[PDB]
From a paper:
The B4GALNT1 lumenal domain construct ΔN46 was crystallised for structure determination. Initial crystals possessed no ligands in the active site and diffracted to relatively low resolution, 3.6 Å. Microseeding during crystallisation combined with inclusion of manganese (Mn) in purification buffers improved the resolution of the structure to 2.94 Å for an apo-complex. In the apo structure of B4GALNT1, a long loop encompassing residues 486–510 was completely disordered. C Surface representation of the B4GALNT1 active site illustrating that in the Mn-bound (purple sphere) structure, without UDP ligands, the pocket is open and residues 486–510 are disordered.
Residue numbers in the entry:
A (entry chain A): 53 to 168, 171 to 189, 192 to 265, 272 to 485, 511 to 533
B (entry chain B): 53 to 265, 272 to 485, 511 to 533
């Protein structure tokens, strides 16, 4: 809402064309570049309308049920902590604004409560909805200790405030991760604030036993009827890393035996699929880090994994891609930007894919921060599992992983770690899937 | 310190023995019940000291490593949004206190900004400061002077208070550098008054919606299991499932040395390297599930008329639960739901924390007789596939594990247990290893079982 309020209706405003254009107007669409012969400094943008992957009758149904499932999702994600709260001006209430948190069914002293010399009597009310208040300061009368509503009354202002330094909140009902919006009040004044109720996060620390690559890194791949390429890969890896474990997910119809020291071969139902096999491979990794390589890759003296290890050891990144070099001699890092822009409510949003990166990774020449990369990368195993390779993407997929991970996964890309590359209804289905899964109406590729 | 500050040193205080005992004193330990013959109303508590799984050397080492990796983890988790901020009393500054959020490298109008100063003054001025973004004011209110549009520091100056406040209604924040999930603590200020507040900078969460296809069980549910050289039990299981659910997919992870053929309609059989193990096989099975929900069953189970999956589906369809366990009935006729409570208590800094396991539940699940909320359950359960994958079956747990899953999920996974959905049950160095693993993984020194 931009429209001027009554109180300020008279006050004149000239719109800043430039800045108002920065706001999300929930009206995005996806348009193709003008067609024909291209121009040198222009990139051709091409649009995909995912709504056209449905029968117009089915489209309505899909949009409805997608909206319904989304409303359900909201209700199980969102917290009173996410409410817009406005701090009142000119209140004598001093209260914690953020960063007050308790474990479920635990207790804490509440910081920073006070009432800001000598009056009649001073009284403050505390109200909670998922917990109970407790504290005795000489001179101060308490009403409601061990209840959701607590009154503190004291002729001593210093006293009242000293007792406030000793006010405790206790979570009274068990929930996993929520919050309780408390009310702190005095005569003619009201303040809302939120205590977060949650468990501390699982830190998932790795035992240890430069860098021990065998201890830190598992190599994961997926193959299908390409045993020649796969064996060349394993041979090449062994030329530089003799004891690193290689996990191989395999959905071949008549699987050959693959074995050797530190190789683990997993057989899947014939044509179970690509991402399913990737999900399989990662689920078997016990090391801090996993390296994804395609079955058609070859290690060279340029595949210096230590450098990728270094990056993840020394930076907050979760995933760091290398570069893949074609036999044509060109090496790509496939640095991609993925952003979702708000579209019409219930049509869905618009995905924008474009080549590029966000910024250089300070301290690490040749490395940048981006949204997606080529399928040669080292990553924290847990973060990869957290995002997952959606087993439904069975045939042709790549960026969809980075899209599933978008914002959750800290992505980087280093050009100096290099691996060599050895020389439909599915499309429609994926369009329907991505429409539903990610609430998209369309996408542009660039 | 409990100690009073100088300002308040003169004030007398009574220690509530009862209340002080509620606080975390970072000093837990784990002690066994007395030995000998038990008494009827008493439950035997048994302690495990995890630290005894290491030599004094290794203990020292591991504590160090663990503390270092923990500090690392903290630094990549924690945010300015976690800082304690205290709202000033008697300030003319009105500002958003929580719930203001922007996507990285995007922009928003900042809600609720205003200066509630008294009218009559010669000039009104407000300062805005950011650290990861820049201010702009969209439409310009006539009478207001702006300094710093498109910079991290912005000044609004106006003779008219009305004008200033109208201008504040139009202030925008833009994120200027890309990060995935962080926050920026802004400063809003006027003469002799200061207000801090935090804008969260993050992407909206992946909603991961499932097409729906009362309830189509084949669409909503995949059944997952893991077997090892027990094809008799497994075939009985599949036969029993098919007696009630002809087209539900059964995913079977298998680490047998010489695997038999399992196949039949809607069966997916996955072969693992010999003896890769228990949780690894569970992790494998779940990684292959495409449905909104997964049902875990052991290879030694049997479906009966009592295995009415629809009821478990109903629970997850109608409640915020992520996982809902059933009951497993022994051939002795007793059915267990194995409702467990798991809690960690803060221990001495760098010895680690104490895990308390005890039989029990938190409360009844309102609206669903026979169902409770708890921390862990027996290995018969329906769950949201994504949440199960989010927690994972640690592939390191190769032999003997159960509650370890619920512990890995503790806090993250919303657990329920219904007594009325029932399945039948057909008639060391590794211990030390697991103890060392649990020590690091969960920063624990000891545990008690009850
Ligand atoms: C590295 O890990 C391997 C295999 O996991 C182990 O056998 C070896 O002792 C480790 N090496 C070092 C230098 O710690
Ligand atoms: C349930 O879903 C399955 C799996 O795709 C489908 O083949 C079957 O037709 C569905 N049953 C009904 C009646 O919805
Ligand atoms: Mn290829
Ligand atoms: Mn058994």
């Amino acid at each position: 809402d931009l429209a001027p309020e009554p109180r300020y209706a008279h006050i004149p405003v000239r719109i800043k064309e430039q800045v108002v254009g920065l706001l999300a107007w929930n009206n995005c669409s996806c348009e193709s570049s003008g067609g024909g012969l291209p121009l040198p400094f222009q990139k051709q943008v091409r649009a995909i309308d995912l709504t056209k992957a449905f029968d117009p009758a089915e489209l309505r149904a899909a949009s409805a049920t997608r909206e319904q499932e989304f409303q359900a999702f909201l209700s199980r994600s969102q917290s009173p902590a996410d409410q817009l709260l406005i701090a009142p001006a000119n209140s004598p209430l001093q209260y914690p604004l953020q960063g007050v948190e308790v474990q479920p069914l635990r207790s804490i002293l509440v910081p920073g409560l006070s009432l800001q010399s000598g009056q009649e009597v001073y009284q403050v009310n505390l109200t909670a909805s998922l917990g109970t208040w407790d504290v005795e300061v000489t001179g101060v009368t308490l009403t409601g200790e061990g209840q959701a509503d607590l009154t503190l009354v004291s002729p001593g202002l210093d006293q009242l405030n000293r007792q406030l330094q000793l006010v405790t909140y206790s979570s009274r009902s068990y929930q996993t991760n929520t919050a309780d919006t408390v009310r702190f009040s005095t005569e003619g004044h009201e303040a809302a604030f939120t205590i977060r109720i949650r468990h501390p996060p699982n830190p998932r620390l790795y035992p240890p036993g430069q860098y021990n690559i065998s201890a830190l890194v598992t190599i994961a791949t997926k193959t299908f009827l390409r045993y020649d390429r796969l064996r060349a890969l394993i041979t090449s890896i062994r030329r530089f890393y003799p004891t690193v474990t290689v996990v191989i997910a395999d959905d071949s119809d008549k699987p050959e035996r693959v074995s050797g020291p530190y190789v683990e071969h997993y057989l899947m139902p014939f044509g179970k699929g690509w991402f399913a096999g990737r999900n399989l491979a990662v689920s078997q990794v016990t090391t801090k880090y996993v390296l994804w390589v395609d079955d058609d890759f070859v290690f060279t003296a340029r595949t210096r994994l230590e450098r990728l290890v270094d990056v993840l050891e020394r930076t907050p990144l979760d995933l760091v891609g290398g570069a893949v070099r074609e036999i044509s001699g060109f090496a790509t890092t496939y640095r991609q930007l993925l952003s979702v822009e708000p579209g019409a409510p219930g049509l869905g949003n618009c995905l924008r894919q474009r080549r590029g990166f966000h910024h250089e990774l300070v301290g690490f020449p040749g490395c940048v921060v981006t949204d997606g990369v080529v399928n040669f990368f080292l990553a924290r195993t847990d973060k990869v599992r957290e995002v997952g390779f959606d087993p439904r993407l069975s045939r042709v997929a790549h960026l969809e992983f980075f899209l599933d991970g978008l914002g959750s996964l800290r992505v980087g890309s280093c050009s100096d770690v290099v691996v060599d590359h050895a020389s439909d209804e599915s499309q429609m289905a994926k369009h329907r899937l991505l429409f539903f899964k990610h609430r998209l109406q369309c996408m542009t590729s660039q």
